[PDB]
Amino acid sequence: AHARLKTQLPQQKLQLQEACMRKEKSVAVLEHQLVEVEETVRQFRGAVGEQLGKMRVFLAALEGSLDREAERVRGEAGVALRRELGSLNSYLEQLRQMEKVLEEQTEFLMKYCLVTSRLQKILAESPPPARLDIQLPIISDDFKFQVWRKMFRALMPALEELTFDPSSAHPSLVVSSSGRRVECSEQKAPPAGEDPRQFDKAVAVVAHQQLSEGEHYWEVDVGDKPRWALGVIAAEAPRRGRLHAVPSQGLWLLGLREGKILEAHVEAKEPRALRSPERRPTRIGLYLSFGDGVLSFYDASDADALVPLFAFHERLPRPVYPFFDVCWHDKGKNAQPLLLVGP
Amino acid sequence: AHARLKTQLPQQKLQLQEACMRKEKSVAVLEHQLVEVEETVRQFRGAVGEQLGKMRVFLAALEGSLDREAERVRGEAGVALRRELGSLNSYLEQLRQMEKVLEEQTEFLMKYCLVTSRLQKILAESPPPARLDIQLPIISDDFKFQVWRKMFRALMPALEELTFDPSSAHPSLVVSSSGRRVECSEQKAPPAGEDPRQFDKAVAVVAHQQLSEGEHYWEVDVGDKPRWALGVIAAEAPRRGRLHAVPSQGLWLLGLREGKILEAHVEAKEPRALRSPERRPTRIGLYLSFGDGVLSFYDASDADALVPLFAFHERLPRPVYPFFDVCWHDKGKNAQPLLLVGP
């Protein structure tokens, strides 16, 4: 019995040592967990400070602009009214000199004609009364709302530097040397090449830059173009031949056709039409955020107020090229170009 | 000739004195004009500072709330993980004591059973592994937009203290003692009195307070009430008998009828219907600003995001009572009350 216990005791000692090692590993895990919680709280504070500081720097920029405009208009008004005051003071000094000369028989008769002529000239040279016109921008109760809508365009990041690929371009379309303007050519196009990257039948161009992650925003000036489409195309999605404008094939579109109808190309038998704004879209900004997987099309005709049109909410694959369907030229009826707005 | 000139000279002196007095008056006008321009620039700076400081104090309040929540969750996590660390340290100390006891024939055999039993109890009392769960609110790219919509409710002023008049109330309607709840009574109403202030046939109540000038905002919880109307009534507008819901008689309404249809009562043959939100309105805030003459009805179901419904833009007369058409009780089908939301 003693030998069995003496042989079993090292096994118990080894088990206790293993338990102590596991406890030490758990204590190290707990310490690193506490450190990581503190670092996560610091990072959350930093990120919320970044967002709210973007809001604060927009507000400070607007306040500085308004204060500078008020200072400039006050300076101009002060300069003009001081010119008027100096002219009035000169006229008053001349009138006082004329009165002093009139206060001072032969010499009086000799000087009376000159004094009367100078007084008549001074009276006829009377400047017109000044006008109380100050044209600083007035701020009513609505003004804060005018700021609030104005905040939206400021919230979105800087316009993504996008350029048009000549290689992926449809053969009819010609891309300008700057890379921000594409338009259809009335002349006959060359036959489509064997390169699968360029579009065969869908008359469209995709931008050069490759959106990968994070928030992105880019604006397209459409003008008064009759029919077009703006959106994103999946990199794995095929391009040769006609393309179904559905998220399932890999196209997220906001195709407008026949001038008035603005239909968002959602998965269905037919792209369901949205409601047209009271004035036609001339400049539309696409906002793609990969973190929440949203793609929103904001009508930006006035840079102050951006009104939403449609927002896809499904998760987006990486990477999606921005996509611009300029469509057929239609014997000059659709010659209006889609141009990227650059900062 | 000399006598005529000598007699005419005082007339010229008096004319010069009058011209000098006019010039002095003009100089005083110019000086006061410059002072008033400087004061107007100071007042414009003060007003824009007030609006942008309202925005900044909302942003600072949100930042303080988020920072306080982060600090509280860090403190709770630290307390819990320190409890776990203390338990692990106690277990490690017990294991070290057991190992030291095992390191130290008759005495060893006597103590071996107790040491083995204590080691087995310590091994069986092993705490489960900790879980890395921190529930601070995560902020994605969308979070700033979540702030921006949240700014709207913060931009509007505090909820106007409004109470229901029992005297102007329709005879069927009963107003609670607090003054923020009105509902129809199933019992038969007394005959309408000769007082012209209360409504004869239009089943409605107007609030006690008299809006005079400036921005004002007040919220009504409608619940799931089938038919009602919210708006403003001109003080000069007659109330006895049926009232045409038009701005020309003096009623600005957002009457909802038959549950789904939400029609803004604009001047026409028929009140033109708006578009219904995807979920029914349960709480609607009216915003009246006399400076720009706007009356806007914002659907406020979530206090963060307020979506506009309709905005009258015509100039409003002073003073307009807020107006609440609770309509006929309809044998218990329309017994749901309209209650004013109070801060």
XYZ file of C-alpha atoms in Angstrom, chain B residues 4-339:
336
model
C -29.985 146.292 -52.993
C -26.798 144.244 -52.541
C -26.543 145.285 -48.880
C -30.148 144.178 -48.320
C -29.654 140.911 -50.240
C -26.494 139.922 -48.331
C -28.355 138.841 -45.113
C -30.516 136.552 -47.275
C -27.362 134.903 -48.643
C -25.978 134.611 -45.100
C -29.208 132.960 -43.910
C -29.144 130.563 -46.876
C -25.528 129.655 -46.065
C -26.473 129.076 -42.412
C -29.367 126.819 -43.457
C -27.054 124.872 -45.781
C -24.529 124.479 -42.946
C -27.282 123.212 -40.626
C -28.387 120.697 -43.273
C -24.769 119.563 -43.716
C -24.381 119.121 -39.945
C -27.591 117.066 -39.842
C -26.279 114.934 -42.719
C -22.964 114.415 -40.895
C -24.829 113.308 -37.756
C -26.917 110.916 -39.885
C -23.715 109.500 -41.414
C -22.107 108.986 -37.986
C -25.210 107.278 -36.574
C -25.399 105.160 -39.740
C -21.814 103.950 -39.252
C -22.513 103.145 -35.585
C -25.683 101.262 -36.559
C -23.823 99.278 -39.245
C -21.241 98.207 -36.657
C -24.008 97.229 -34.215
C -25.850 95.302 -36.954
C -22.679 93.346 -37.759
C -22.245 92.576 -34.045
C -25.874 91.394 -33.816
C -25.516 89.192 -36.909
C -22.396 87.627 -35.395
C -24.327 87.042 -32.173
C -27.281 85.417 -33.932
C -25.136 83.107 -36.076
C -23.141 82.255 -32.949
C -26.402 81.366 -31.204
C -27.558 79.001 -33.973
C -24.186 77.313 -34.435
C -23.769 77.109 -30.653
C -27.077 75.265 -30.425
C -25.618 72.795 -32.930
C -22.338 72.613 -30.984
C -24.052 72.059 -27.628
C -26.074 69.185 -29.113
C -22.861 67.653 -30.487
C -21.111 68.117 -27.127
C -24.027 66.524 -25.248
C -23.958 63.501 -27.571
C -20.167 63.219 -27.212
C -20.426 63.376 -23.422
C -23.151 60.716 -23.366
C -21.126 58.354 -25.574
C -17.938 58.944 -23.553
C -19.804 58.310 -20.286
C -21.255 55.060 -21.656
C -17.782 53.948 -22.782
C -16.330 54.786 -19.357
C -19.118 52.887 -17.571
C -18.731 49.761 -19.716
C -14.931 49.874 -19.261
C -15.386 50.140 -15.494
C -17.836 47.230 -15.362
C -15.581 45.062 -17.544
C -12.559 45.925 -15.405
C -14.423 45.070 -12.194
C -15.618 41.700 -13.534
C -12.228 40.713 -14.973
C -10.502 41.778 -11.738
C -12.877 39.514 -9.798
C -11.909 36.680 -12.154
C -8.203 37.538 -11.748
C -8.527 37.489 -7.956
C -10.246 34.096 -8.060
C -7.515 32.750 -10.363
C -4.797 34.139 -8.071
C -6.414 32.484 -5.038
C -6.589 29.176 -6.933
C -2.929 29.506 -7.968
C -1.893 30.244 -4.370
C -3.813 27.173 -3.172
C -2.133 25.043 -5.856
C 1.303 26.377 -4.860
C 0.593 25.583 -1.198
C -0.514 22.060 -2.158
C 2.660 21.557 -4.216
C 4.805 22.804 -1.319
C 3.021 20.412 1.057
C 3.554 17.542 -1.399
C 7.268 18.398 -1.628
C 7.677 17.976 2.143
C 7.458 8.095 5.757
C 4.789 8.068 8.469
C 4.101 11.815 8.289
C 4.136 11.724 4.478
C 1.659 8.826 4.452
C -0.555 10.624 6.982
C -0.585 13.891 5.005
C -0.834 12.289 1.536
C -4.570 11.555 1.806
C -5.404 15.113 2.902
C -3.136 16.624 0.226
C -4.685 14.446 -2.497
C -8.230 15.267 -1.345
C -7.518 19.013 -1.291
C -5.838 18.856 -4.717
C -8.794 16.928 -6.173
C -11.228 19.462 -4.692
C -9.197 22.347 -6.143
C -9.069 20.662 -9.564
C -12.826 20.011 -9.510
C -13.423 23.653 -8.477
C -11.826 25.020 -11.661
C -13.712 28.116 -12.874
C -14.896 28.120 -16.500
C -12.913 30.155 -19.053
C -13.839 33.816 -19.276
C -15.778 35.326 -22.180
C -14.550 38.320 -24.224
C -17.810 40.256 -24.496
C -17.778 44.071 -24.544
C -21.050 45.734 -25.539
C -20.058 49.309 -26.248
C -22.025 50.719 -29.221
C -20.030 50.121 -32.390
C -19.766 53.030 -34.828
C -19.512 52.245 -38.536
C -19.264 54.614 -41.507
C -23.047 55.132 -41.255
C -22.796 56.392 -37.648
C -22.254 60.050 -38.576
C -25.424 59.906 -40.698
C -27.156 58.433 -37.642
C -26.018 61.554 -35.796
C -27.091 63.880 -38.623
C -30.739 62.809 -38.711
C -30.608 62.836 -34.893
C -29.595 66.499 -35.119
C -32.981 67.472 -36.611
C -35.051 66.860 -33.462
C -32.318 68.662 -31.523
C -32.400 71.673 -33.853
C -36.056 72.405 -33.143
C -36.780 74.284 -29.888
C -38.265 72.788 -26.732
C -41.803 71.429 -26.938
C -44.329 74.232 -26.540
C -46.275 73.970 -23.291
C -49.793 73.361 -24.610
C -52.967 72.520 -22.694
C -56.510 71.815 -23.877
C -59.274 74.353 -23.282
C -62.359 72.766 -21.673
C -64.456 75.817 -22.593
C -63.612 75.733 -26.314
C -63.918 71.932 -26.363
C -66.569 70.164 -28.398
C -69.405 69.065 -26.048
C -68.802 65.338 -26.617
C -65.083 65.557 -25.866
C -63.706 65.270 -22.339
C -60.353 66.852 -21.405
C -58.347 65.278 -18.583
C -57.319 67.208 -15.474
C -53.672 67.346 -16.588
C -54.737 69.111 -19.787
C -52.743 66.967 -22.230
C -55.325 64.262 -23.024
C -58.673 64.576 -24.795
C -60.991 61.765 -25.768
C -64.514 61.274 -27.048
C -67.238 60.165 -24.643
C -69.674 57.392 -25.546
C -72.379 59.064 -23.443
C -74.678 61.627 -25.035
C -73.267 65.151 -25.125
C -75.055 68.190 -23.664
C -76.431 70.697 -26.197
C -73.928 73.175 -27.592
C -73.840 76.457 -25.710
C -74.296 79.936 -27.122
C -70.580 80.705 -26.607
C -69.070 81.311 -30.080
C -65.570 80.276 -28.944
C -66.401 76.577 -28.682
C -67.005 74.469 -31.773
C -70.615 73.727 -32.724
C -70.414 70.918 -35.299
C -66.687 70.404 -35.967
C -65.615 67.867 -33.339
C -62.350 69.463 -32.255
C -60.377 71.123 -29.465
C -57.910 74.013 -29.631
C -55.046 74.393 -27.201
C -54.995 77.009 -24.450
C -51.744 78.772 -25.315
C -51.693 81.486 -27.975
C -48.765 81.306 -30.397
C -47.676 84.834 -31.317
C -44.223 85.004 -32.935
C -41.036 83.075 -33.570
C -40.289 79.390 -33.886
C -42.600 76.933 -32.129
C -42.765 73.146 -32.077
C -45.253 70.773 -30.473
C -45.772 67.019 -30.744
C -49.039 65.068 -30.696
C -49.181 61.344 -29.988
C -51.990 60.085 -32.212
C -51.502 56.372 -31.517
C -53.276 54.132 -34.022
C -56.274 56.460 -34.265
C -58.299 55.885 -37.472
C -59.232 59.485 -38.331
C -58.058 62.841 -36.967
C -56.590 66.165 -38.064
C -53.780 68.339 -36.716
C -53.020 71.916 -37.660
C -53.648 75.556 -36.862
C -56.795 77.693 -36.833
C -56.836 81.461 -37.283
C -58.228 83.369 -34.310
C -60.521 85.430 -36.559
C -61.785 82.304 -38.348
C -65.344 81.300 -37.377
C -65.846 78.041 -35.512
C -69.618 77.529 -35.271
C -70.983 75.118 -37.851
C -69.061 72.959 -40.283
C -65.669 74.370 -41.283
C -64.070 74.098 -44.712
C -60.517 72.801 -44.241
C -58.810 75.382 -46.431
C -56.191 78.104 -45.788
C -58.687 80.660 -47.160
C -61.149 80.169 -44.284
C -58.188 79.917 -41.896
C -57.489 76.221 -41.257
C -54.160 74.529 -41.977
C -54.727 70.793 -41.536
C -53.061 67.412 -42.039
C -56.226 65.339 -41.733
C -55.768 61.581 -41.920
C -58.915 59.566 -42.636
C -59.763 55.872 -43.099
C -56.513 54.768 -41.447
C -54.277 54.805 -44.522
C -55.034 58.006 -46.454
C -53.001 61.006 -45.237
C -54.240 64.097 -47.092
C -53.000 67.662 -46.606
C -55.980 70.041 -46.693
C -54.830 72.566 -49.317
C -57.174 74.954 -51.162
C -58.900 72.940 -53.887
C -62.109 71.109 -54.685
C -60.642 68.142 -52.789
C -57.798 67.905 -50.247
C -54.989 66.360 -52.265
C -53.572 63.212 -50.687
C -49.905 62.842 -49.809
C -47.938 59.590 -49.850
C -48.287 57.397 -46.784
C -45.117 56.369 -44.923
C -44.212 52.687 -44.874
C -45.390 52.470 -41.249
C -48.345 54.424 -39.915
C -47.790 57.690 -38.001
C -48.066 57.337 -34.231
C -46.552 60.687 -33.177
C -46.427 63.837 -35.321
C -44.663 67.119 -34.549
C -45.944 70.429 -35.890
C -43.370 73.183 -36.458
C -44.628 76.741 -36.942
C -42.144 79.491 -37.788
C -43.658 82.957 -38.213
C -40.451 84.562 -39.497
C -40.456 82.659 -42.785
C -44.162 81.798 -42.483
C -43.787 78.015 -42.611
C -45.888 75.276 -41.010
C -44.316 71.837 -41.395
C -45.663 68.479 -40.202
C -42.836 66.070 -39.364
C -43.546 62.406 -38.696
C -41.686 61.701 -35.439
C -42.100 58.022 -34.599
C -38.417 57.552 -33.853
C -37.078 60.637 -32.075
C -33.814 60.274 -34.019
C -35.146 60.467 -37.595
C -37.958 62.904 -38.418
C -39.321 62.613 -41.963
C -41.329 65.536 -43.401
C -44.921 65.032 -44.500
C -46.167 68.430 -45.723
C -45.207 72.087 -45.297
C -47.499 75.060 -45.813
C -45.470 78.064 -46.979
C -48.019 80.903 -47.053
C -47.743 83.764 -44.577
C -49.560 83.063 -41.358
C -51.786 85.514 -39.491
C -51.186 86.363 -35.868
C -52.283 84.587 -33.650
C -53.052 80.970 -34.755
C -54.300 78.543 -32.139
C -53.098 74.963 -32.522
C -56.065 72.885 -33.637
C -56.858 69.201 -33.089
C -59.830 67.589 -34.865
C -60.523 64.389 -32.919
C -63.641 63.718 -35.099
C -66.713 61.620 -34.289
C -66.275 58.674 -31.926
C -67.935 56.277 -34.434
C -69.542 53.791 -31.971
C -66.198 53.043 -30.306
C -64.171 52.590 -33.501
C -62.564 56.038 -33.042
C -62.176 56.090 -29.250
C -58.381 56.431 -29.461
C -57.244 59.729 -27.891
C -54.991 62.468 -29.203
C -52.543 63.317 -26.412
